[PDB]
Design a protein around this ligand. Structure first.
Ligand SMILES: Nc1ncnc2c1ncn2[C@@H]1O[C@H](COP(=O)(O)OP(=O)(O)OP(=O)(O)O)[C@@H](O)[C@H]1O
Ligand SMILES: Nc1ncnc2c1ncn2[C@@H]1O[C@H](COP(=O)(O)OP(=O)(O)OP(=O)(O)O)[C@@H](O)[C@H]1O
Lengths: 319, 54, 319, 42
């Protein structure tokens, strides 16, 4: 009857998310503040219970969700439009009922629906059969709890707001556009993406890095980082000639890839080199440059047309 | 530290050049596997002159 | 519930494939390196997650997949987009969910999805029934186990990258163009496809062939090969005049097809003919000549322009 | 003879590539030049 859907703990902190922290503010005020100081929400002021994030794919909407999950100290349920919401006939809606029952049962709780648009209908076969009655079930269930007392939060996500029908829109609470990262956000993300690995940590070139990348997503940035990270590895694979660097003051000899002509340039397979004696080329700007070169114009303007149109019309709008 | 930000152009250019040289070398080796000496010669010459220009 | 997927070994080695050794390297790094040295993935160094193979039909995409499976040294899952389309109209994606569960439970595993431009075609209006739900199911399920602990690699295959949506495009990672074979690659494939037949000699003929046959696929090459191999059988069938060749030191006079005018031309048919006394015609250039006459080019150059356009746009990287 | 000379050429190419991988341009130049001269000598 019930069918439990994951409440696992990601480990993504607030600080791992760079950018437009007004959304973060809305989150913290909508979730954490109610928990922390409940007496602030008595009488005619009642806590916000619906939030839905929209924008191009790859912009950490899912990442943001995981951060929220990490930060909530609450039950976090997460489910898609295909996930546990069908049958022969009929009882998907019942499953939805049982779920929201369970949500009420567990205060605080958070329901996260990715790709909320995929639960929509106004004319087709789903409007005749299921998807209408699904939509109706949703609408009715988001009605009464929103009146007066609630320990459930509804979190939406969508790339395509405009294909989600008008019926949900005004009945739902709070919506924010998640744009692609700007210069500063890209730069911060670079720094975050470097972590512990040493050389080069040039603070001055980070801003050049964020400059050079324009319009790319979090995902894209991640990909470029990974791409740069395999460069020393690919060197090693193509490397033959290695040489000692760590002196006898250290525990033992340690070999790194080196120019083929050098005094101490001995040639073998990288597979012969064990982990204790192991050393890797440093990370240069050149590695990152190469990484950028494999990255192309990633994001189509066509997204920007409709996403910026919805932005001009609704945007930071609650909806 | 120490970066004027106009070097990156030259750097990526020279990197592309290096890549092209590498490609040429590979093609020459391929040609040698096919016992095609003149092709090999031409590709190594093109790599050589491409190397010389920077 | 399970829906049985074969993971057995299609014994096709690296060396049986010709070309794009750089994609082969990416694959070696994507599977083999993880297998060989997993302890190299502490900190910010993390495995590649998804690779799309895109290009014209018939270019050994399936062949490549076989080689991957042979070389993976792990559980390998293979599926066509034909599979798991629908059962009732209601229930499809549960099977996808269960599939991914199975894959997650087998680390390392590799999922290969053929013709990812089917499911996900994509065209509007008609998508809103089950197909949008599927589209969603992909996107959400790739988000599930993706972070931290991965033993899944996703390989897609597509003929039509340009109709695969933005949403998949910059979520699903690394995209690689599989071109038609060039002169070199064709020649190598010719040399690969020989068998026991002594045939026509040298490399000169091979290079002649690979030169003369242009704009054709591995599949097309295979077809031509089979044709040529059957041509002596075709000679045997159509000419009932045969003639002795070998000396009496063998079991008996060894008989091959000849013209009705030929000296020694006996005209009995294949039916009376003993297993030992058999002399197949040698494989000549003329078989390949007639094969070329029979070989028509497959793919229009507009498709080449669209593949080339995508390549100009996204190319040898995911984006 | 023509087999070992090709092998030597290949080796020299490999050495040039290693050199380029570590931005040792003069070494690369000299190794490609030796490969080319040797190729001409075949
Ligand atoms: N500061 C950041 N901003 C944006 N994205 C980030 C950031 N840090 C990490 N990421 C990336 O976010 C990805 C998580 O998925 P993401 O949120 O981008 O999907 P999405 O945009 O929600 O699209 P979908 O709705 O299809 O899941 C990770 O793979 C990671 O590389
Ligand atoms: N190096 C190669 N390049 C291209 N094709 C090859 C190569 N080696 C073998 N083949 C051929 O590949 C064929 C296997 O099917 P193939 O992978 O070409 O279909 P496909 O490219 O997946 O097309 P589709 O996506 O329409 O199924 C075999 O008939 C085999 O002869």
């Amino acid at each position: 009857l019930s069918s439990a859907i994951l409440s696992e703990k990601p480990n993504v902190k607030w600080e791992d998310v760079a950018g437009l922290e007004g959304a973060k503010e809305a989150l913290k005020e909508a979730v954490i503040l109610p928990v922390k100081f409940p007496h602030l929400f008595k009488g005619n002021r009642k806590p916000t219970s619906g939030i839905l994030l929209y924008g191009p794919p790859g912009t950490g909407k899912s990442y943001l969700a995981k951060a929220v999950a990490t930060e909530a100290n609450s039950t976090f349920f997460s489910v898609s439009s295909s996930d546990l919401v069908s049958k022969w006939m009929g009882e998907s809606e019942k499953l939805v009922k049982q779920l929201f029952a369970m949500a009420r049962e567990n205060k605080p709780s958070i329901i996260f629906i990715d790709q909320v648009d995929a639960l929509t209908g106004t004319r087709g076969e789903g409007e005749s059969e299921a998807s209408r009655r699904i939509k109706t079930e949703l609408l009715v269930q988001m009605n009464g709890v929103g009146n007066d007392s609630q320990g459930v939060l509804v979190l939406g996500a969508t790339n395509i707001p405009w294909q989600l029908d008008s019926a949900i829109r005004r009945r739902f609470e709070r919506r924010i556009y998640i744009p692609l990262p700007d210069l500063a956000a890209r730069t911060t993300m670079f720094e975050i993406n470097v972590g512990d690995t040493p050389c080069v940590l040039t603070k001055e070139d980070y801003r050049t890095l964020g400059a050079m990348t324009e319009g790319y997503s979090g995902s894209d940035i991640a990909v470029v980082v990974k791409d740069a990270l395999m460069q020393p590895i690919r060197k090693i694979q193509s490397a033959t000639h290695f040489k000692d660097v760590s002196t006898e003051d250290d525990e033992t000899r340690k070999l790194t890839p080196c120019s083929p002509g050098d005094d101490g340039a001995i040639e073998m397979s990288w597979t012969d080199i064990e982990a204790d004696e192991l050393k890797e080329p440093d990370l240069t700007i050149k590695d990152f440059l190469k990484a950028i070169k494999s990255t192309r114009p990633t994001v189509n303007e066509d997204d920007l047309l409709k996403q910026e149109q919805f932005t001009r019309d609704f945007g930071q709008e609650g909806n | 530290k120490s970066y004027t930000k106009d070097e990156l152009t030259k750097i990526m250019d020279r990197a592309s050049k290096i890549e092209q040289i590498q490609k040429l070398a590979k093609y020459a080796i391929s040609a040698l596997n096919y016992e095609d000496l003149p092709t090999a010669k031409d590709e190594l010459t093109k790599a050589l002159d491409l190397l010389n220009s920077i």
